[PDB]
Amino acid sequence: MENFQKVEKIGEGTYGVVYKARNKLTGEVVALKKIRPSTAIREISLLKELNHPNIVKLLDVIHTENKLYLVFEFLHQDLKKFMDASALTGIPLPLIKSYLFQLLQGLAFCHSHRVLHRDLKPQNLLINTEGAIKLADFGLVTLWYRAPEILLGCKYYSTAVDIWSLGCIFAEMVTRRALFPGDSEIDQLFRIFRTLGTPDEVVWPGVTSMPDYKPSFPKWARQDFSKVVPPLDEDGRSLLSQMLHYDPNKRISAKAALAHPFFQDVTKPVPHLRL
Numbered sequence: 001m002e003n004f005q006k007v008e009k010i011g012e013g014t015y016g017v018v019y020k021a022r023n024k025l026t027g028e029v030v031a032l033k034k035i036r037p038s039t040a041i042r043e044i045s046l047l048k049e050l051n052h053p054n055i056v057k058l059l060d061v062i063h064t065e066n067k068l069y070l071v072f073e074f075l076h077q078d079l080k081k082f083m084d085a086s087a088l089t090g091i092p093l094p095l096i097k098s099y100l101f102q103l104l105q106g107l108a109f110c111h112s113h114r115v116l117h118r119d120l121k122p123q124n125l126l127i128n129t130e131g132a133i134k135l136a137d138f139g140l141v142t143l144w145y146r147a148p149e150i151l152l153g154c155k156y157y158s159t160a161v162d163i164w165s166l167g168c169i170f171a172e173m174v175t176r177r178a179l180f181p182g183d184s185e186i187d188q189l190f191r192i193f194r195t196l197g198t199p200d201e202v203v204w205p206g207v208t209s210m211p212d213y214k215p216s217f218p219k220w221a222r223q224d225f226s227k228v229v230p231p232l233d234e235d236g237r238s239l240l241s242q243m244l245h246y247d248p249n250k251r252i253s254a255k256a257a258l259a260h261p262f263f264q265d266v267t268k269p270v271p272h273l274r275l
Ligand SMILES: O=S1(=O)NCCCNc2nc(ncc2Br)Nc2cccc1c2
Pocket: 010, 011, 012, 018, 031, 056, 072, 073, 074, 075, 076, 077, 078, 079, 081, 123, 126, 136, 137
């Protein structure tokens, strides 16, 4: 830790602050995450074994007199910043397609190892000048991307939460507006309800038995999906609706998402970044 020189603060999260930092020995630029603890240690260290090109690599873990330092590979930008920068013109569809494909590759990998991200959001998605996109900062202040089963109090939720989050992100990339920008836990859920229809036993069996479910919920009509992500094409709209199915068991999995016609013409363009 005496090994690193803090260059600047590049981000912060609910349980950490992130610094750009150079290793004084190797010369390498890394992302340092300062945290504040024993079960988390194994868990964090099991995430070290996680090796995939679409997952931001955890290089080292450093535990100094209480204070957990996580050292991550360094990427020059995050997706929120890239979306804000592309606000007026739009990210080109080929690039959106590529990004989704890669992120689904990341998820398919993590998921086959029974590891979930849990807190996917544009700030946890990092891009390079080479057209790569990577999942960063796996969880162990934004509910905009939180799956409905979590919101409904399901404790033992599955990999499917990460697909829901990714669907929200996909829509957001396409429309340049957050899909479900909730103000609270009940506003998040009713905003989902206003768009996808109040769920019940017809579309999501078991739903009325969920911890936080209330027979008092307003009943909204599922709205026209053509109204959600115009002018996305039918292949794209088709994948997205499957990524946003209420019932986690019928929600499309990452691996199956890779085989969707939408990705028949997938390519690898680069962004124009301003670093
Ligand atoms: O403004 S940012 O998009 N904020 C993203 C912070 C997330 N942490 C992070 N950042 C970068 N590489 C790896 C990691 Br982890 N790289 C990075 C470099 C410069 C600017 C940013 C990120």
